[PDB]
Design a protein that fits this description.
This is part of a larger assembly, with chains A (187 residues) and B (57 residues). Chain A has 187 residues and is mostly helical. Chain A has a domain of 79 residues: Alpha-Beta Complex (Actin, Chain A, domain 4), CATH 3.90.640.10. Helix content of chain A is 42%, strand content 6%. Chain A is globular. The chains are: A mainly alpha (187), B mainly alpha (57).
Chain lengths: 187, 57
């Protein structure tokens, strides 16, 4: 996004400016269910543009860049990465598992963390994986409102489970072994 | 001596009912253990105090 906004005439290079671009993405961006159709209109009309307030009273108006940036999730080549995207990774994680595993993984794709809040992402991911998946099979995405924070919650759940109170490295075992112990005790 | 045979065999039998109820108790423990699993699946997520420090400050 810093580079695409440069193309539009707004240079963001310093720390304050870099923090703003991150904030712009968080408030204005989305992925879109259908990139090409979304770009066909975003690239043609102001009706798909949104203005962001820069903290000096000036504004920046962003159009198809609003989705072309998040689109990197489906097209990593946008940042020089060799990858077919997040739906390829989801797909191969299912495909490389045994066929009696795959049915349960297809039905349980889990969104966690940020980017999962972008408009079109839960629907787009389900569409992108079902497109690679065999027919008959049900492909489904889990994407709760506990977005961007559910992993913290999972931390809270695990830390407080009775099943987990034997999983702790104690300050006895650590002092005797040193930090390499974490490799044997955690996972 | 009939009593001695009786106490031999009935000692055996009370030890046997002992072991039978012992297996009943062991299987109560094990089936109720997998049942602890079953109901924990359902009840563990709430064994937690939540939404305390959210606002008080």
């Amino acid at each position: 996004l810093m580079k695409i906004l440069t193309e539009r005439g707004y240079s963001f290079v310093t720390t304050a400016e870099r923090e703003i671009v991150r904030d712009i993405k968080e408030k204005l961006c989305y992925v879109a269910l259908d990139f090409e159709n979304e770009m066909a209109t975003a690239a043609s009309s102001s009706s798909l543009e949104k203005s962001y307030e820069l903290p000096d009273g000036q504004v920046i108006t962003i159009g198809n860049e609003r989705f072309r940036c998040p689109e990197t999730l489906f097209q990593p080549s946008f940042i020089g990465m060799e990858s077919a995207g997040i739906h390829e990774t989801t797909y191969n994680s299912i495909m490389k598992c045994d066929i009696d595993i795959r049915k349960d993984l297809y039905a349980n794709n889990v969104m966690s963390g940020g980017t999962t809040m972008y408009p079109g992402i839960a629907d787009r991911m389900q569409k992108e994986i079902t497109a690679l998946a065999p027919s008959t099979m049900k492909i489904k995405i889990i994407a709760p409102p506990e977005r961007k924070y559910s992993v913290w919650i999972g931390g809270s759940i695990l830390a407080s489970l009775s099943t987990f109170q034997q999983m702790w490295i104690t300050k006895q075992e650590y002092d005797e072994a040193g930090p390499s112990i974490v490799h044997r005790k955690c996972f | 001596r009939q009593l001695h045979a009786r106490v031999d065999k009935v000692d055996e039998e009370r030890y046997d009912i002992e072991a039978k109820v012992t297996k009943n108790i062991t299987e109560i423990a094990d089936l109720t253990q997998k049942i602890f699993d079953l109901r924990g699946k359902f009840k563990r997520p709430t064994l937690r105090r939540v939404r305390i420090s959210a606002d008080a400050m």
